[PDB]
Symmetry: C2
Subunit: 563 residues, 2 copies
């Protein structure tokens, strides 16, 4: 039936994570920049009539990787496509976002479906097959569901989402990591213009001045489960997928041209199959690439399908994040889904950019659709959950469309750890920023998540806090190395002797168990940082807190490029 | 009634301790040497102690600079006295505030003059260090000093004025100025005994070397010259003691004579006459003098003799008296109760009667003493612990224990561990180990000394491990775990924790078999040189 999205991680132009992404969207920020010479020299390729676009939605630090975290030799890192490296990181972080760790994922029937469409690094070098790109994560975490790369060009990550959904419903897997990754590493590839690119370097979605897309980079992952399992497992749930479908354009006027009829059929069939009335939908994240013939075809298709069922006018907002971050290709779908989920969570619609005058080839006034250019509350009538769609179409003609529905749910001991001390310090900084930014965080949920939803690694710190202010001060104290009697920190390999007593002796265990049961948190904390395994469940009686989204591991930022 | 001797320590010519002393006596060794030029430039002979300058002032909370200003007589007795307590199995903790008297025989001031150093302070050193509360009295009755002290301590214990007494003597010969039978050769020495009422010693489960069943002191009075002896006074002394305390001369089988080798014939006649008043029996009582081995140890003479007698009783063995070829012309042995023993032989007793002996000590000032001693007749892995105030001394302690165990094939391992646990202060530098046999024990100590890794051996400096044992000191279930460990089996765990500084309740290791304290090697003091500043 319904598929729950229980974890996400995103890395897009101008946004190192989904929290920065959200902030940028709310503030209607455009992340497209001129291509710097550190990538390539546009002047050596630029011709205005060769490349005729000098702009890109770019990721920062595409060379950074933490190979030691993944048990990969540093020298092997140089030989890895950064698309592989970046997804390995984001994919991992999605799991941690959900509150799952290596221990809890071991032997899980989790499928991995990875959108990917380019091979630039591999060619530059003359391990880097699509097949291996997908298999990296399963190999690392010991997952047992199929690992499949999907190259349907720009629809890739949405197509993957469909396949994962069907495998989950058919009970072939019990979890799914779906995502996409796209980088533009060479003048040659980003180049193919074929007439595709805008000379102004913007995706002018829905606008009469639409004249092509600007290439964007991105890497995004989702964690999917059956809704029934997600509720039983007490996951935190971003939203639910209540319908999806994929099809083909077939014979068009040129293989990269779109088909109105196919787009209508896709959308109509989905709504009919899953009993979804177009009136129930209030936002659509369009493919919306800002191409002159593509935009009006998409608009006309969707409008027509909606109008078949309803006379209501201008009830459904449309937008495209490609207006913000460019066309992130294989990662386009996951970028779009993540926008909609964030919109749902905050009950807020955000502006679509670069829209001045409606495309002449489509009339909005008598349409169910309207272009939203406002930061405004996402209103819903009665009790009803918000519903949205995401479309993604590829140049090869393979189309995807999913329907997402809002999910409507019915002193603490803080522990942190990392594989190196430097990353532990980075972790504490990320948590401090997060708590600073999120004034309403549930302290018990957060602590519970750090306890049960993160792997205890070798470098540890812990502390007590009963308030946001106390929490922030503890982290500040830790970071500033200024003495605080409630802060504990150790390297586990150093302390083995100081812990053995509680591991072997019968009365010491019984003491430790009593400590945990009577909530003697200082004592539990001191021992935990030293490496003692704590049964966290014992900390909780009638009331158990819930896992929530927190910042994920802050990987070492080590530079690896061509050998 | 009876007084138990529950601790002893001794340092005599040729003997750094009471075990070497015994060995020397058994082998009829003579410790008299020519006086070297390092003492002074030269009678040219003396019974000398070795390294009289050596002291461990830090152990005793004394500034190293003060040590140079201390009479070495004070310093050496401080050490020997302390070791006597440890021999008995008592430590700083268990002695704190005890009503223990200190009676110290001392009769010279050489160092003070050469240069704090009063007799009054000499006696008070140990009480000050250990916080004892019985009177501290120095006794100068010349060569009878330590035996006079013994008498006074005995009377105080019987009157219940004190509950313990440290009695002792110390004599050094530091200057040329203060310095067959032909006179005596001067000897140096320091000795101490620990005394208790017998009833207390048995209730407290002390180990008991022997019991004092009679003692007396008196004066020569008017003699022909103040340093001459009085046959009559010696007789009266001995008779009065035997009569007061119901002691029949026939029961006595050894007498350690004053026996300075001058005097001799008067002592022989006196004792012989007193014995003969009560018995016709001939040549039943052996006589000797340890002054033939070690010289005339002066203030320490009494304690040296008492220790010889106790060692004899313990080993049920009589040892040779030396330098005897032909009897003194002025006394006829053949029809006497007395005979000079020159043999190493079994000390025989009839029908399981306890052996009895006497010690006589007579001073040049005319103050005499005589005491009567009776032999005392009493009715799995272990955890061995050692500690010292410096690592160097811990190493020396381990060596001393290994030698001791090597020399004593019949040591009770449980008793020894028990003594190391309860009868020594746990100090800052620690080692511990398990053993279930003599061989394992010796091996462990060897391994420790040779620095050969051994999984049964644990060692730590306590100041370094504080953070590591806190986990056990305050928490209730950690204590329960420790109590389960020590209540009871894992010993390895108790050992690891103990060396790190955790206080253990040694009693809990024992359900209703409890082992007994025994004599073991005492602290091996740092051997630092201090002399005139």
């Amino acid at each position: 039936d319904a598929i729950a999205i229980v974890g996400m991680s995103g890395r897009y132009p101008g946004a190192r994570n989904v929290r920065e992404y959200w902030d940028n969207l709310v503030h209607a920020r455009n992340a497209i920049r001129d291509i710097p010479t550190s990538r390539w020299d546009v002047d050596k390729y630029y011709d205005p009539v060769k490349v005729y676009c000098k702009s890109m939605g770019m990721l920062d630090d595409i060379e950074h990787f933490d190979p030691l975290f993944f048990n990969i030799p540093p020298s092997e890192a140089e030989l890895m496509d950064p698309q592989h490296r970046i997804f390995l990181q984001e994919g991992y972080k999605a799991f941690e976002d959900a509150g799952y760790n290596a221990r809890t994922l071991n032997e899980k029937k989790c499928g991995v479906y990875l959108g990917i469409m380019s091979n630039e690094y591999g060619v530059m070098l003359n391990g880097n097959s699509f097949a291996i790109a997908a298999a990296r994560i399963p190999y690392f975490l010991n997952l047992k569901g199929p690992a499949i790369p999907i190259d349907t060009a720009c629809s890739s990550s949405l197509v993957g989402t469909h396949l994962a959904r069907q495998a989950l419903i058919n009970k072939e897997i019990d979890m799914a990591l779906v995502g996409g990754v796209s980088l533009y590493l060479t003048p040659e590839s980003y180049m193919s213009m074929a007439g595709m690119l805008s000379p102004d370097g913007q995706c002018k979605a829905f606008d009469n001045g639409a004249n092509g897309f600007v290439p964007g980079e991105g890497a995004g992952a989702l964690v999917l489960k059956r809704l029934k399992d997600a509720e039983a497992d007490r996951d935190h749930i971003y939203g639910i997928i209540i319908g999806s479908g994929i099809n083909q354009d077939g014979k068009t006027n040129g293989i990269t041209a779109p088909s109105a009829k196919s787009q209508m059929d896709l959308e109509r069939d989905i709504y009919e199959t899953y009993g979804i009335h177009p009136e129930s939908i209030s936002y659509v994240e369009m493919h919306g690439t800002g191409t002159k013939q593509g935009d009006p075809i998409e608009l006309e298709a969707l409008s027509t399908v909606f109008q078949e069922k309803t006379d209501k006018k201008q009830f459904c907002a449309i937008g495209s994040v490609k207006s913000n971050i460019g066309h992130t290709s294989a990662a386009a779908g996951v970028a779009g889904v993540q926008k909609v989920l964030l919109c749902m969570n905050h009950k807020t619609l955000v502006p679509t950019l670069n829209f001045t005058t409606p495309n002449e080839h489509f009339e909005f006034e008598h349409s169910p659709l309207y272009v939203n250019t406002e930061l405004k509350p996402w209103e819903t009538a009665d009790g009803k959950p918000r519903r949205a769609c995401v479309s993604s179409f590829g140049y090869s003609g393979t189309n995807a469309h999913i329907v997402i529905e809002e999910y409507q749910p019915e002193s603490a001991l803080f522990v942190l750890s990392a594989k190196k001390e430097k990353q532990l310090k980075a972790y504490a900084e990320a948590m401090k920023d997060f708590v600073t930014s999120n004034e309403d965080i549930d302290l018990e949920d957060m602590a519970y998540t750090l306890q049960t939803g993160r792997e205890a690694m070798d470098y540890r710190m812990a502390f007590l806090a009963d308030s946001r202010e106390m929490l922030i001060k503890a982290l500040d104290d830790y970071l500033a190395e200024m003495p605080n009697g409630s802060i504990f920190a150790a390297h586990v390999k150093t302390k083995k002797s100081e812990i053995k007593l509680f591991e072997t002796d019968h009365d010491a265990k019984a003491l430790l168990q009593t400590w945990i049961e009577k909530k003697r948190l200082e004592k539990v904390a001191e021992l935990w940082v030293k490496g003692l395994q704590i049964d966290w469940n014992k900390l909780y009686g009638e009331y158990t807190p819930r896992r929530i989204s927190l910042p994920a591991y802050p990987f070492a930022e080590e530079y690896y490029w061509l050998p």
